[PDB]
Amino acid sequence: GGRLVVFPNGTRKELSADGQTVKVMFFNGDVKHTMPDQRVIYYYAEAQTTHITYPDGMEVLQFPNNQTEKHFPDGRKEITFPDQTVKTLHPDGREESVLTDGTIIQLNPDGSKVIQFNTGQREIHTADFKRREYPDGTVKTVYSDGRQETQYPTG
């Protein structure tokens, strides 16, 4: 029916009957579960933080302010902030944020960006210009040289 082991330092270990699941309760309040599929779930008592390691290389952190950070095996990092904005950082330096209101911000490592507003407008920033595109077909652009351009809708 399983076993409980208590060590002289106060750390306790519980083993399932099939020995597949192990739970370790450390003397400092930390708790570690090792699951049959080899997922390791570690709870830091003082920091109130959970760190989960998956056998495929993925790692997930859950912070007590309800922030979650996911690290994919490729290097990708995905943050869900308390507000539920999702920000993805790619190893190349690209960053993408998907806001709850619907806004999307794409930032390139060269510093260029594309912003998609929940209002249906789109903004593009490059080394040569900042451009705003409107749902009615209007395009407005300011160039690095200071000139401003409005392209009117065909209709």
Partner: peptide
């Protein structure tokens, strides 16, 4: 025996 992982945050 068994010892926990080091705390991520510095002690107060």
């Amino acid at each position: 025996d068994l010892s926990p992982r080091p705390s991520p945050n510095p002690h107060p």
